[PDB]
Design a protein around this ligand. Sequence first.
Ligand SMILES: Nc1ncnc2c1ccn2[C@@H]1O[C@H](CO)[C@@H](O)[C@H]1O
Ligand SMILES: Nc1ncnc2c1ccn2[C@@H]1O[C@H](CO)[C@@H](O)[C@H]1O
Ligand SMILES: Nc1ncnc2c1ccn2[C@@H]1O[C@H](CO)[C@@H](O)[C@H]1O
Lengths: 279, 284, 282
Amino acid sequence: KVKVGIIGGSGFDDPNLFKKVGVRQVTTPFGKPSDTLVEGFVGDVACVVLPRHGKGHLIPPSEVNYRANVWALKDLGCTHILATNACGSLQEDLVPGDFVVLNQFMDKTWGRENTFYGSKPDSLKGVLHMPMAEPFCERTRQILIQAARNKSINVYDKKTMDKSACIHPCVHAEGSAVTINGPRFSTRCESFIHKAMGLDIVNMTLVPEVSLAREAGLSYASIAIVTDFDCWKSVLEQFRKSVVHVREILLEAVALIGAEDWTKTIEANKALVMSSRQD
Amino acid sequence: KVKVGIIGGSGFDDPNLFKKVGVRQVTTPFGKPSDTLVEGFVGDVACVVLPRHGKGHLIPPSEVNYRANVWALKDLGCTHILATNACGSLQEDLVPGDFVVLNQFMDKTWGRENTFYGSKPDSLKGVLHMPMAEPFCERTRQILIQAARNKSINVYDKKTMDKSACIHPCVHAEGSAVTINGPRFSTRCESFIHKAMGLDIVNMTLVPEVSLAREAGLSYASIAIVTDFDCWKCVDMVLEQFRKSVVHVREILLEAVALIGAEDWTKTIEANKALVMSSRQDLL
Amino acid sequence: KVKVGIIGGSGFDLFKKVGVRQVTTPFGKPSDTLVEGFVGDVACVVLPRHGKGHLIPPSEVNYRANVWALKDLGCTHILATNACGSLQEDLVPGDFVVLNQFMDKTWGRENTFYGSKPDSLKGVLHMPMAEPFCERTRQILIQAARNKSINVYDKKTMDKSACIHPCVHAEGSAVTINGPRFSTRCESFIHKAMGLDIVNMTLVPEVSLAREAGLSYASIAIVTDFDCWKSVCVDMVLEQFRKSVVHVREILLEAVALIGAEDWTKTIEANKALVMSSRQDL
Ligand SMILES: Nc1ncnc2c1ccn2[C@@H]1O[C@H](CO)[C@@H](O)[C@H]1O
Ligand SMILES: Nc1ncnc2c1ccn2[C@@H]1O[C@H](CO)[C@@H](O)[C@H]1O
Ligand SMILES: Nc1ncnc2c1ccn2[C@@H]1O[C@H](CO)[C@@H](O)[C@H]1O
């Protein structure tokens, strides 16, 4: 019943997380996904891998068909989506090499299809107004964090640990992301403004992927990879080692997801979609 | 003579504000309005009603044809537009059941047609740069407020009265709205950011409706309906509270139309159109 | 050698022209035809942002075509003028700002040369924009003002009481809004509380696209009024502008000469190198 979709960002243009069982060239009512979808098994848990930018990373963040990617995963029977998201750090405690299991975001994107529903032929009929107060699936967030612990990777929770317990590299138990449209990076002026707003990282791909996953009735969680500090503070090796440990986290997270019942969580996801219909 | 247009938001998809005299199924050079326009009278005052989202609430905020809506009302000869706007509160003193006669906004929408003019053939010829310092028609704002007074609804003015005078439910005499694109609600992160900017409410429909009304030379005023606290902070009571708010807003609207028709608006209307002409930057 | 493109904003819709040139671009047609000529020995190209009739609003300007057309003609530098409203007390109508920073609030504009759609160059370009302008070219605009005996105010070293108007502000940040409407008081105060200096509609993505084209770009903002945070309309932007046009013209002509008097070999190399190294599809 549980099937785990994986959307790989930078460093995961072609992951190979398991032996490929089948390759799926699909289309959706909202167009074609970034690439073909690879189906397989992690242990006894069915799993589907999909590169957000395509195999060659030729599709910029603003042009990614988030609808197609999410809906395609949904059509294949995924109940969860795990995503990676490379990012810049807006805080001194978040150091290149750290990961962040996001729990909040601020949206500054535009010109992207951010919803499956509407009044145009491009969309499913209805007006969907989805609650996003806490935009991720909390259970699945805690999976990612527990996965890191299982793989002996440091975890820092600012709510229960003081500064001295922050050993790098570490996974930050929470954090907020600002999603900019791209493709350019932020100016120093924009970086300081975001930092003053209390944001933790800056990224170009989280939104509307996270929003559409909830719309599709899926449990979604992102692991953000701190590649560098954003330009408020004036290499490839740290990122190479990062994807190795992110691979471990993803593989362990899939197993942890399959080790539990999700019947009521899946049911509540579906009901929230139906209850958010305004029409 | 005046003619008052009414753009009904949530809770006003099918208003029935008066006995329908005539219905207009029209189009504009900017496309189709949300729905048929219903014409009639409030007393001796001509009035036109249009649901922003259509009868069945099938049109989401981002896809509403604000241009067509404002232009269709203009074509029928409306001089004023009164709008309802459902919203979430960003401040402690603004509670569900309150109303807000907006005077300010902050815009965070995109991908919406927000001007009638441009250099493209599918827009009116010319470049219009409208001043928007005080984006509403002040006279018409004060009419909404006085209408609330006449209907025995509490009015609260933070600049004059102590917070000890804020008695719920009340019409807030001033307020700023942040307009987000939707269709999703804000995250807690976005809610606290907006609140820290000093914004009072969050809503998805105010802009560019208010902007386009000024571009059309019309007097525009919005009454926001506080349906809930935004996520910075039983549903059966929430629904019942909103229904009561709708009853109150309905009588405010009806009294407002009567108040408008009772006064002379020659100079205000003249100033409305002159403001349009003087913003034509291509006329130098 | 060097060649200077000049993108004129409001009131700039400069020399003895050699010829007028019509050009096309893989991203459409520029705002207008281009004026080719010389300031001294320095080749110079002049392009009005809104067209000769100012019929093109800021959100509909083809910044891609304008910047690329200047590139196609062999420009190494672009000087730009941008009319703006002030968000702070010390910046008054008649002042000028040699911008070093911005905050972007535009939408629906073509802001990159690269992408995966047919009407764009193939590739994913992620350009660093920490310091979005060419610093050398900024300091040239500022030095140009000194040569023409226009006051220069540096808020990093100078007193608020030592601010002599009209002056060129040696640094400043712009918020770029989409237009065509002006800001509300609410928006104006929010921008002010963010620490931004001016508000305008034309800087972005022009500045971004110039760096994509590997050109040294600098902007001089012309303060036409205070934004509505004080006690702004179309007619006001035009009137104040008149006296400011003359000073800006002097600065631009002087700046062109100053550019032509230095070697830009390594700067140009670095510009084109930054373009290549930002390609993340490779
Ligand atoms: N400091 C930043 N600001 C915005 N995006 C960033 C960073 C750092 C990494 N990314 C992500 O990686 C790609 C561009 O480098 C894009 O996919 C982007 O999401
Ligand atoms: N807390 C909020 N944030 C943003 N919009 C809100 C609310 C509450 C109500 N609305 C308005 O009503 C519709 C969404 O329910 C939309 O039409 C919207 O304008
Ligand atoms: N206070 C302001 N806010 C926004 N834009 C302003 C100003 C003042 C000038 N401009 C510039 O003038 C043009 C539109 O009038 C546009 O080119 C615009 O950049």
